Amino acid sequence: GFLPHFQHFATQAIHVGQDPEQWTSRAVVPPISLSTTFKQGAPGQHSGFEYSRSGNPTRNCLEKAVAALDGAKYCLAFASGLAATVTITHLLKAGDQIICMDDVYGGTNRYFRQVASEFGLKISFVDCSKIKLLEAAITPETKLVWIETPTNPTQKVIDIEGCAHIVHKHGDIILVVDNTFMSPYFQRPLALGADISMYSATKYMNGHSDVVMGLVSVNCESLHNRLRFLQNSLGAVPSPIDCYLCNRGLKTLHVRMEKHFKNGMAVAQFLESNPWVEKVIYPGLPSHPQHELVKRQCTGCTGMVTFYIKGTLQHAEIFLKNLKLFTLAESLGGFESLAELPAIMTHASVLKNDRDVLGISDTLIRLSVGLEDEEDLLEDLDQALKAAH
Amino acid sequence: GFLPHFQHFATQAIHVGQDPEQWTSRAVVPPISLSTTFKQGAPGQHSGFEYSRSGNPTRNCLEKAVAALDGAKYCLAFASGLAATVTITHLLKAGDQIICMDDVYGGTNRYFRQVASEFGLKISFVDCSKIKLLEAAITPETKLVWIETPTNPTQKVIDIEGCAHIVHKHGDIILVVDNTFMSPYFQRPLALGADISMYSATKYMNGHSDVVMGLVSVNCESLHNRLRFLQNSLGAVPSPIDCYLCNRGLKTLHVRMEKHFKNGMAVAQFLESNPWVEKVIYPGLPSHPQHELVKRQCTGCTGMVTFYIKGTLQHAEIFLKNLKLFTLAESLGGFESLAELPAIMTHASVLKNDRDVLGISDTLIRLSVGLEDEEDLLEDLDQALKAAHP
Amino acid sequence: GFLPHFQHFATQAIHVGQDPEQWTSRAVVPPISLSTTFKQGAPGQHSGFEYSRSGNPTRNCLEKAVAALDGAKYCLAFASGLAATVTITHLLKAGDQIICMDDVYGGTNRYFRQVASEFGLKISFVDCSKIKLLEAAITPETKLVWIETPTNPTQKVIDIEGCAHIVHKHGDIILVVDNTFMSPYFQRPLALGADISMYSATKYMNGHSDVVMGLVSVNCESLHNRLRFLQNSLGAVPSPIDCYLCNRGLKTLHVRMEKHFKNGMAVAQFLESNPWVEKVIYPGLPSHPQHELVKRQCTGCTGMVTFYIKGTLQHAEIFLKNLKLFTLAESLGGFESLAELPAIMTHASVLKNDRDVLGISDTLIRLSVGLEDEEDLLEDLDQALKAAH
Amino acid sequence: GFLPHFQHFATQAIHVGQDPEQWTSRAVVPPISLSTTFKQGAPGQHSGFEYSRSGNPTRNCLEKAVAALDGAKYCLAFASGLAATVTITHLLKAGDQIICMDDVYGGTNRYFRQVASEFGLKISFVDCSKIKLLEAAITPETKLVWIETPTNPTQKVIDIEGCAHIVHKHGDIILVVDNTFMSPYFQRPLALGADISMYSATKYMNGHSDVVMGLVSVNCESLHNRLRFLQNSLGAVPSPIDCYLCNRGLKTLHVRMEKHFKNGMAVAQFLESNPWVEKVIYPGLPSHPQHELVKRQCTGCTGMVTFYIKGTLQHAEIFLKNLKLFTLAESLGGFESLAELPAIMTHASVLKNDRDVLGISDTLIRLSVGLEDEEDLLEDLDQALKAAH
Ligand SMILES: C=C(NCc1c(COP(=O)(O)O)cnc(C)c1O)C(=O)O
Ligand SMILES: C=C(NCc1c(COP(=O)(O)O)cnc(C)c1O)C(=O)O
Ligand SMILES: C=C(NCc1c(COP(=O)(O)O)cnc(C)c1O)C(=O)O
Ligand SMILES: C=C(NCc1c(COP(=O)(O)O)cnc(C)c1O)C(=O)O
C-alpha cells in the first residue's frame, strides 16, 4: 500500500548526464576529467569550463543524474554530506535562526550546536514529528528548517507535506529534508513540498562504501544561483573520480534499494520475534507510530533497522562482538551489512542528556542491512543474540 | 645569494609517510584506501581509523609528508584551497576581525568580502607589504591576519618575520601565510614566524594540473586540535585518490621547482630585455622592489612571471591569441606553461576600483612558466609579442 | 523449472576476499595497491609479495571472490578476455590440436585461426551442439576443447556434462567453457564437468562497461600451477585499479543478473510476437531448440537476445539507427542496453563463408538488454521496428 | 662529452597527444576514458573508436607521446614489459629463429627459453656485445634479434648501430632494443638503426612505482600494422588509468632522469673508490669497458649502478640488510632508491650455468639510485658497507 514507484527512475539513473554526444569519442560512459583548468579561445570566453572548482565534466554529469532522480531542476555535489550542510547554512546571514530536527546525525547536531551557533545564528532543536511543535517554534527570524526523515538513529518520521504547509505560510523560510536514509528511489522530498533535497551520498546513493560525498537538489532559480555561488566560493567540492564512482553506484541504485527493502523487512520482523529484543523501530513495520504516513509519502523502505536489545550495555557489546557477518563499524547504505551502537560511536558527538531525551540509550542498536543472502543475515543475528541472551 | 636550500628536503618528500612497514603487503608505495568505514573490535575501540571523514590511511600519509616539507608538526588536507581558507576562518567567532592582504587571489577576496563578512566578521584589506600599515590596522578584535607572498598576481613581497614580530606582539592573533606561489622548497613561513602555512595544493604541490586540494600546516598544539575538529566537523575533506595523486606529485616537487626557477628566470629576463614589455615583475630579478628581501626570505624563485605589455587591452588580447605553446587558461603551477590576464579572468571577482588601486590593469599579464624546453618558451613569447606590435 | 539458485552466492560475492583483517586499517573495502614492488625482509624472502605482476593484494582479493562465485579453488585475472584465451592456449605445445566451438566470439575465432595456427597448433571448428560431432573430431593430438554456451551470437547451447563425458574418456584433454554470456550466477561449468570456467569480465562480471579484463577459474592443481606460471611469465595481467573496479561490480552481480533476466525475457517475448521479426533466439523462450537443456543446466537467463529482422540489410541498419534508448555499439553485459549488427561489427573478423554457415547474416541483430525501465525498452524497440517498415 | 641532448624532448613529453582541442571541454590534461565501447552513427561507422581493446583516447594519447619521445612514427602500449615481449614474438611463425642477448632480464630469458621455444621457435643466446659473434650466429631462419643495452644486471653495452648494420644485411630480420635501463631521454635506438624501441614502462618511463606497463615504438609501416593487429588480437592491453598515470609520469621524465644521472654518478664514483667494493659497472665511469661507446650512442647515464661486494655471498646479504634509506626490493627506475641481489631475486629464473658464465655471481649488487638527497644516499651506502666490511 505504498506510493506507486517513480516512473522513469531506472532509465534516468542510467542515462541522464551520460549522453555519448557530449564527448568526441562518443563513449557510452562519461570519462573522468581530472584537468584543473581548460583552454580558452579568449580571456574569459570558455567553451563551458574555466576551472575545476567552478565546474568540470564528470561532476556536471553526476549533478544532472541526481537532479533527475530527485525530480529537481538542479543539483550540486560536495566533498561530504556535512560539507553540503555547511554550504546550505552559508545561505543565511548573522541574525537568522535555524530550526533543526530534534533527532539528527551526530555531526549535524555537532555542527549546528558547536560551530554555526558561534557566527550569529540561533539553533533550535524541535521534534517536528509532532507538527504543532514546529509551528510553535517558528519565529520572524526563522530562515531555515532542517529535517531528517526517518531520523538517525531513532527513525522518527516527519510529514514533509505537512511541514511544507506550515513552513511556507511565513514566506521566506527554506525547508531542507536530509533524504539520506530513504534515497530518491523511495522518497522525493521536493515532490512533497520541500525546497531542498539533500543527501549524504556516502551512504545509499553511492552505495559501495568507498566515496564520501554530499548532494543537494533544488528547484528554485534564486535558491540554486545562491547555492551555486557558494559551491565555487567555499570550495567544498568533490573529486571528479569520486563523482565518477558515485555516478557509477547510481546505475544500480534501483536494484540495490529493492534488495535493501526485502532484507531490511526480513530483519525487522525477525528482531520483533526475538525474545531478546525489547523494541524494533522500522518504518516498514505496522508497529511503527508513523507506518501509515510512510506509505503515503514513500514508495518503500530501506535496510536501516533500529532496535533495543534487552538487558544492559554489556549485552549490547557481547551481541556486537559475536557478529560474524554483520561488521561492527560506522556508516550505512552499503552492499555489506553493518551494525553499530550510536550512543558510543556515531552519536557520541550528541550531548549525553540529549541522547537520553531522544532515546539513544546504551541498548539502542542500529543496523544497516546489506545485500547478503537473507537466511545468512538472520542466522548471524540469532547466534549473536543468543550469545548475549 | 639566496637562503641555503633546506636539508633533507628531497629525501623527506619521497619517504615521509611512505613507510613500507605500515602495510601488510609491505608495499613501497602507500595503497589508495577508499573504504568509508573500518571494522572495530569493540564499540569505539578502533584500529586507528573510525570514519573516512575523520581520517584515513592515504590522507594521513599525505599530511605527514607535507608537515615534514614545511618543518611543521601537523598538516591538514582539504577539498580545495578555498576550503582550507574557509576552515581557517571557522577558527574565529562572531565579532572577530580579519585583516587580509590588499592584493590576494580573487577567490580569497571574494570569500572574505561577500561571505565571511555576513556572519559577524569584519574584514579589512591592508597593504601589509608596508609593515607599519599593518600595525595601524590591528585592533583588540583582530584575530587573524591573512597574507600572500608573493601576492597574486602583483607579486608584492612581505617580510614574513617582520609581520610575525608585530602580529605576536598583541597576543592571540593567528598569522597565515598562503605559500602557494613559492612552495615549501623555496619558502618555509613556519620557520619565519608564521602560525599557519597554507597552500592551494592544486598548483605546485601536486604540480600536475589534475588535483583540486588545499593544505594547512601548523605547529601550535592548541591551534592544530581546533583545526582538526573543524576538518571533521565541516567535512570539506579531499578524496583519498586525490591524496594519493598529490602525494605522487610531491615526489618530484624538488626537481620540478628547480626547473620552474630556471625557465621562470629565463622568461623574466627575456621579457625585461624585450622592447614591447613595459615592466616585468619577478622576485628573482634585481628590478623587483623587494628582491633583496626575497633572497633573505627564500631559497629560490618560482615560475610565476607577471609583466605589463606595452599598449592597451587590444594588444594584451592579440598577444594572448598568438601564443602557440603557452595556453590561455586559469590556474598555475603545472608542468605546462600557462598565460592569463587576471583583470578579466582569475581576478575578475575583485572590484574594478580595487583592481585599479592594486595595478591589476587591462595590460597586466600573468605567466605560469612550465617545464618545457627553454628555447621553445622564449620563441613563443617573442613571436606573440611581435604579433601584437607590427 | 530452472536449476535452484546457488546457495550463499550473494554473501560470497560481497565478503570473499574482502576480510578487513587483511589490512592494518581494518578497512571494510580492500584498498587499491598500485605499488609495483614490495619491501623484502631478505634477498628473495618476501612477506607474500615481491612484484606486482606475480601478485598484488587487490588482484588476489578479486581472484578469491571469483573462484568462490564459480565454486572453484583457484582463479586468475588477466588484461582482457582474449588475454585469458591466449594464456590458456599457451598451456599446449607445438603439435597439439585445439577443437573450438564453431560459433564463437569473432576475436576468439580470429586468434585461433590466424595466430595460434601459425605456431604449430591445429585448429578445428566443430558444432559441439551435436555431441557426436565432437566425439568424431577428437584426435590423439587433441589437448584442448574450447566451448561457448550460449554461443556468441547465434546462442547455440551445449550440453556441458555431455561434452565432459566425451572429452574425459580420452584422458589428457582440457575442457574450457567460456561462461561470459551466463555469468556464475546462472551457470557453473565446473560443477557440470568442465575443467576451466573462463570469462570476459568486460561484460557481466564487472557489468559497468568500464573495465577490460579476463578471468579463469580452475580446480585441478596441476592445471592451476601451469596457468599461474603463464600469468606471470606472459605478463598479460590487469591493473590493480581495474581489479578493484571489477570486484566492486561483483558486489551487485546477483541483483543485476536478476534484472537482466526479467528485462531480457520481456524483450525476447515482445520481439517474437512482433510482425517485423522473422525469428528470435533466446535461451529463456520455449522456442529455443535447447530450452530444456538450459533449464537443466542453468538457474536462469540473461539479457542477451538475438533476433532476425524481416527484410534486408537496409532494414537492420534503419532499425539500429532509429533506436533512441538502446545504443548502437559493441560489447555487452552492462547496465545500459546495447544493439549491434555482428556480421559487420563484432564478428567481421569471421570469414563471410563461415558467417553464412553459422547464420550470422546481414539481418541478425544482437541485443544486450540493460537495466533500464522495462516499458521504455519495449517502446524503443517498437518505434524503431516501425521505422524500418 | 656525451651526445647532445635530444631537441624539444621536454616540450614533446608535456604536449604531444595532450592537445586540449581534442576534447569538447578543451581540458588541458586528457581525461581518463574508462568506457569499454563507443556509440556508432551507423553499423561499422565509428568516430575513431569502436572497442576499448582496439583503442581508446587515454591510451592513444600516451602512445603518441612515447612515439615522439622515441623519434618514432608509432607506439603501442601493453599490460607489461613481458606482454610486449610476447606480442613481439608473435610477429614470427613456427620454424623461425630468435637470437637473444646472452645477458637479459630473467623474465625475458625465461619466456624465450621455456615458453616460446615450445611453439616451433628456436632460441639462440649470443653475446652480441662482441659484434662478430652476432654475425656468425645469424641463420637464414633468423627473423628477430633481441638485445638489451645496457644489459640487466651486468650492464654490458651493445653498439646498436653496428648490430643494425649486420642484421639488416640479411634482409627481413627484426632488431629490437629493450631501452628500459636508459629511457628515451638518454638513448634513441631507432635513430641508431634499430627497428623496434621497447620499454618496460614500469621502470623509468612511468617512474613512480605504481604502473605495470610495456611500450614498443616502431617506424616501419608494415611492422606497425602487424604489431597493431596483435595488440588487439592478443588483448594484452593496459588499463586506461595506468595509461593516464604513465602519461603523467612522462611529464617529469626529463627532470627525473637528470637527477638520476647526477646521483648515480656520485654513487658510482663513491663505490669505485670504496675499499670494500670489488668492481663497479657504471656506463658513466671511465672504468666501464665500453665507456667511450656509451658517449657514442647516449646523451647521458641513469641511476642504475651495479657493483661487486668484496668478500662472499654473506657479506652481500648483510650489506643489503643494514641499508636504512635504500629499500631491498625488486624492480627499478623509481624516485626511491632500491637495492637487490639479482642472482637470487630478479634473475633467479636464469639457469645457474648461464648466470656464472655471465658474471651474475653471489656478490653482484644492483642499485637503482633514486631522487633522494645525494649526501643521504652516500651515507646509506657508507654505513651498510661498514657493517658488512
Ligand atoms: C555517518 C553516518 N551518517 C552521516 C550523515 C550525514 C553526514 O554525511 P557525511 O558524508 O559523513 O558528511 C548526513 N546525513 C545523515 C542522515 C547522516 O547519517 C552514520 O550515521 O554513520
Ligand atoms: C586559480 C588561481 N588561484 C587559486 C588560489 C587559491 C585557491 O585555491 P583552490 O585550490 O583553487 O581553491 C589560493 N591561494 C592562491 C594564491 C591562489 O592563487 C589562479 O590564480 O589561477
Ligand atoms: C566484444 C564482445 N565480446 C568479447 C568476448 C570475448 C573477448 O573478451 P575481451 O575482454 O573483450 O577481450 C570473449 N568471449 C566472449 C564470449 C566475448 O563475447 C562482443 O561481442 O561485443
Ligand atoms: C623487474 C625488473 N625488470 C623487468 C624488465 C622487463 C619486464 O617488464 P615488466 O613490465 O616488469 O613485465 C622487461 N625488460 C627489462 C629490461 C626489465 O628490467 C627487475 O629487474 O626488477
> What is the enclosing helix (H) or strand (E) of B357?
helix B352-358
Question: Is there a binding annotation on residue C330?
Answer: yes
Catalytic residues of C: 53, 105, 178, 203
B-chain CB neighbours of D209 within 8 Å are 28-29
C334 - beta bridge partners? none
> What is the enclosing helix (H) or strand (E) of A85?
helix A81-89
**What chain C residue is nearest to D346 in terms of C-alpha separation?**
C44
Ligand 2 mean position to B189 CA, how many Å? 18
> SS3 helix, strand, coil % of chain A, rounded to 5?
40, 15, 45
Hey, how many other C-beta atoms are within 10 angstroms of the C-beta on A193?
18
Phi, psi at D266, each rounded to 5°: -65, -40
Burial A103-140 (b: 16+ CB within 10 A, else e): bbbbbbbbbbbebbebbbbebebbbbbeeeebbebbee
* Header resolution in angstroms: 2.5
Burial class (CB in 10 A: 0-12, 13-18, 19+), B312: exposed
Lookup result for grid cell 561434452: C163
Lookup result for grid cell 623461425: D96
Let me know: does A250 contact A17? Beta carbons within 8 Å: no
Let me know: does A81 contact A332? Beta carbons within 8 Å: no
> What is the enclosing helix (H) or strand (E) of D364?
strand D364-368
**Helix, strand, or coil (residue A280):** strand
Give the strands of the sheet with A304-309, arranged side by side.
Answer: A277-281, A304-309, A364-368, A338-340, A327-328
CA distance A371 to A260: 6
For testing the chain A interface, which of B38, B241, B248 should be mutated: the one with the most A CBs within 10 Å?
Answer: B241
Helices D81-89 and C221-234, axial angle in degrees (round to 10): 90
CA distance C80 to D239: 10
Let me know: does C79 contact C87? Beta carbons within 8 Å: no
> SS3 helix, strand, coil % of chain D, rounded to 5?
40, 15, 45
Ligand 4 mean position to D200 CA, how many Å? 6
* Domain boundaries along the sequence of chain D: 7-253, 254-389
Identity of the residue in B31, B37, B49 whose CB atom sits nearest the CB atom of C33? B31
Let me know: does C246 contact C205? Beta carbons within 8 Å: yes
Q: Supply the residue whose CA is at minimum distance from atom 8 of ligand 1.
A: A81
Across the A:B interface, residue pairs with CB atoms under 8 Å apart total 209
**What chain D residue is nearest to A35 in terms of C-alpha separation?**
D29
Here the cell at position A67 is: 537532479
Among candidates C322, C338, C337, C340, which has minimal Cα distance to C372? C337
Lookup result for grid cell 603551477: B333
Q: How far is CA A70 from CA A196, A216, A346, C344, in A?
A: 10, 10, 27, 41
Distance of residue A200 Cα from the nearest chain D Cα, in angstroms:
26
Which residue in the list D203, D310, D355, D366 is annotated as catalytic? D203
Ligand 2 mean position to B227 CA, how many Å? 20
Hey, how many other C-beta atoms are within 10 angstroms of the C-beta on D362?
18
Q: How was this structure determined?
A: X-ray
User: Would the CB atoms of A208 and C29 count as touching at under 8 Å?
Assistant: yes
Superfamily of domain B254-390: Aspartate Aminotransferase, domain 1 (3.90.1150.10)
Omega before B153 within 30 of 0, i.e. cis: yes
CA distance D244 to D231: 18
Distance of residue A157 Cα from the nearest chain B Cα, in angstroms:
26
Omega before C150 within 30 of 0, i.e. cis: yes
Using only C-alpha atoms, chain D has a radius of gyration, in whole angstroms, of 21
Let me know: does B32 contact C34? Beta carbons within 8 Å: yes
The reply to whether D204 belongs to the active site is no
Q: Is the dihedral of CA D305, D306, D310, D316 positive or negative?
A: positive
User: Would the CB atoms of B327 and D8 count as touching at under 8 Å?
Assistant: no
Residue of A200, A331, A338, A347 with the most ligand 1 atoms within 8 Å of its CB, for mutation? A200
Let me know: does A366 contact B43? Beta carbons within 8 Å: no
Hey, how many other C-beta atoms are within 10 angstroms of the C-beta on C238?
29
Q: How far is CA B148 from CA B18, B176, B198, B253, B260, in A?
A: 30, 8, 10, 20, 19
User: Would the CB atoms of B371 and D14 count as touching at under 8 Å?
Assistant: yes
Let me know: does A304 contact A349? Beta carbons within 8 Å: no
CA distance A157 to A180: 13
**Helix, strand, or coil (residue A78):** strand
To 5 degrees, how large is the angle CA C246–CA C250–CA C252? 130
User: Residues of chain C whose C-beta is under 8 A from some C-beta in A?
Assistant: 7-11, 14-15, 18, 20, 28-29, 208-210, 248, 251-252, 254-256, 258-259, 325, 327, 329, 334-336, 370-373, 376
Residue type, B260: H
CA distance D276 to D310: 5
Identity of the residue in C44, C82, C119 whose CB atom sits nearest the CB atom of D94? C119
Here the cell at position D280 is: 663497479
A353 - beta bridge partners? none
Give the strands of the sheet with D277-281, arranged side by side.
Answer: D277-281, D304-309, D364-368, D338-340, D327-328
In CATH, the number for domain C7-253 is: 3.40.640.10
Using only C-alpha atoms, chain C has a radius of gyration, in whole angstroms, of 21
Would residue D71 be called left, alpha or beta, if left means φ above 0 and alpha means ψ between -120 and 50 degrees? Answer: left
CA distance D316 to C68: 44
**Residues annotated in a binding site of D for substrate:** 53, 105, 110, 330
Let me know: does D273 contact D382? Beta carbons within 8 Å: no
Across the B:D interface, residue pairs with CB atoms under 8 Å apart total 89
Contacts of D222 (CB under 8 A, 6+ apart): none
Segments of chain A assigned E as strands: 74-78, 97-101, 122-126, 142-148, 174-178, 196-200, 214-218, 277-281, 304-309, 327-328, 338-340, 364-368
Which residue in the list B70, B102, B103, B178 is annotated as catalytic? B178
Q: Supply the residue whose CA is at minimum distance from atom 12 of ligand 2.
A: B81
Phi, psi at A178, each rounded to 5°: -75, 100
Q: What stretches of A153-211 show up as alpha helix (H) in DSSP? A: 160-167
CA distance A161 to D14: 56
CA distance D323 to C353: 66
Burial class (CB in 10 A: 0-12, 13-18, 19+), D238: buried
- For chain A, the distance separating the N- and C-terminal CA atoms, rounded to the nearest angstrom, is 36
Distance of residue A196 Cα from the nearest chain C Cα, in angstroms:
27
Residue type, D314: Q
To 5 degrees, how large is the angle CA D48–CA D52–CA D54? 65
The per-residue DSSP string of D126-149 comes to E-TTSHHHHHHH--TTEEEEEEES
Ligand 4 atom closest to residue D153's alpha carbon, by position in its atom list: 20
Phi, psi at A197, each rounded to 5°: -105, 115
CA distance C211 to C203: 9
Residues in chain C: 389
Pocket of ligand 2 contains residue B332 by CB under 6 Å = yes
Pocket of ligand 2 contains residue B283 by CB under 6 Å = no
Hey, how many other C-beta atoms are within 10 angstroms of the C-beta on C273?
8
**Helix, strand, or coil (residue B143):** strand
Superfamily of domain C254-389: Aspartate Aminotransferase, domain 1 (3.90.1150.10)
CA distance C106 to C358: 12
User: Which ligand is nearest the CA of B88, by number?
Assistant: 2
Identity of the residue in B38, B327, B345 whose CB atom sits nearest the CB atom of A43? B345
DSSP state of B368: E
The β-bridge relationship of strands D338-340 and D327-328 is: parallel
Three-state helix/strand/coil letters over chain C? CCCCCCCCHHHHHHHCCCCHHHCCCCECCCCECCCCEECCCECCECCCCCECCCCCHHHHHHHHHHHHHCCCCEEEEECCHHHHHHHHHCCCCCCCEEEEECCCCHHHHHHHHHCHHHHCCEEEEECCCCHHHHHHHCCCCEEEEEEECCCCCCCCCCCHHHHHHHHHHCCCCEEEEECCCCCCCCCCHHHHCCCEEEEECCCCCCCCCCCCCEEEEECCHHHHHHHHHHHHHHCCCCCHHHHHHHHHHHCCHHHHHHHHHHHHHHHHHHHHCCCCEEEEECCCCCCCCCHHHHHHHCCCCCCEEEEEECCCHHHHHHHHHCCCCCEECCCCCCCCCEEECCCCCCCCCCCHHHHHHHCCCCCEEEEECCCCCHHHHHHHHHHHHHHCC
**Helix, strand, or coil (residue B224):** helix
CA distance B95 to B93: 6
Ligand 3 mean position to C219 CA, how many Å? 24
A4 - beta bridge partners? none
To 5 degrees, how large is the angle CA D352–CA D358–CA D361? 60
Omega before C184 within 30 of 0, i.e. cis: no
Three-state helix/strand/coil letters over B53-67? CCCCHHHHHHHHHHH
**Helix, strand, or coil (residue D215):** strand
CA distance A145 to A123: 10
Helices (H) and strands (E) counted in chain D, each on its own, are 13, 12
Q: Supply the residue whose CA is at minimum distance from atom 1 of ligand 3.
A: C331
Helices (H) and strands (E) counted in chain B, each on its own, are 13, 12
Among candidates A339, A70, A302, A78, which has minimal Cα distance to A207? A302
Long-range CB contacts (within 8 A, 24+) of A373-376: A373/C7, A373/C8, A373/C9, A373/C10, A373/C11, A374/A262, A374/A263, A374/A266, A376/A325, A376/C8, A376/C11
Which residue in the list D64, D74, D102, D105 is annotated as catalytic? D105
B339 - beta bridge partners? B328, B367
